[PDB]
Paper text:
Among all bacterial pathogens, Legionella pneumophila maintains the largest known set of translocated substrates, delivering over 300 proteins to the host cell via its Type IVB, Icm/Dot translocation system.
We next solved the crystal structure of another novel metaeffector, the previously uncharacterized Lpg1148, to reveal a domain (residues 123–304, Table EV4) typical of eukaryotic ubiquitin proteases (UBP) involved in the deconjugation of ubiquitin or ubiquitin‐like proteins from their targets. The de novo crystal structure of the metaeffector LupA (123–304) was determined to 1.9 Å resolution and reveals that LupA belongs to the ubiquitin or ubiquitin‐like protease (UBP) family of proteins with a canonical cysteine protease triad (inset). In vitro activity assays confirmed that Lpg1148 is a ubiquitin‐specific protease whose activity is abrogated by a mutation within the predicted catalytic triad. As Lpg1148 rescues the yeast growth defect caused by LegC3, we hypothesized that this inhibition may derive from the catalytic functionality revealed by our structure. We therefore hypothesized that Lpg1148 (hereafter referred to as Legionella ubiquitin‐specific protease A—LupA) removes a ubiquitin modification from LegC3 that otherwise supports its activity in a proteasomal‐independent manner. While polyubiquitination of LegC3 was present when co‐expressed with a catalytically inactive LupA (or in the absence of LupA), no ubiquitination could be detected in the presence of wild‐type LupA, confirming its deubiquitination of LegC3 in vivo. These data reveal another novel mechanism of direct effector inactivation—the specific deubiquitination of a cognate effector—and suggest that LegC3 activity may depend upon modification by an endogenous (human) E3 ligase.
Numbering used by the authors: 123 to 192, 199 to 304
Amino acid sequence: RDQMQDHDMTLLMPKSQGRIVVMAVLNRYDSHSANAIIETLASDVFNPEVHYIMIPVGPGHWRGVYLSKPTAYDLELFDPYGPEGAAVLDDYVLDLLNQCGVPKELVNIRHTGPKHPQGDAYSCGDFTCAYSHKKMKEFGAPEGSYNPILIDTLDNLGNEDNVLRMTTREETRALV
Ligand SMILES: [Cl-]
Ligand SMILES: [Cl-]
């Protein structure tokens, strides 16, 4: 029941493939973290070959950011506890996008949460990793590029009986 840390997310998050980019972990408290990625994120925002950009945003209470290109960009802000808590990312992400050169009028925000939230701090990483895999599939990634075990656990069970944490451990060991 410890929380996922950066390296845990890095290991288990889906990886960029083709028109889907998955960025490295962002730390919303460290101004340097946002500053350091503007150029990479701007490059992807304005690259015709990229259509989707995912960002895991922490630390601590991990959340997911999913940008879909069209004029306006769809920006889904996912909070494992439920959609209301995703409000904490609105300004953060809008400012990140404005730094990249996207005005706020071109951004369609929506807040989301999971079907089966647990509402405990320790599993936010697990939810965000598994939800990111679910998005990977939704965005049309090929069968090998996402982890069906995590998607199907999340979708049907959430982290009831800590089963999502068990799949994240097991899938991790497989990767190691
Ligand atoms: Cl879900
Ligand atoms: Cl906790």
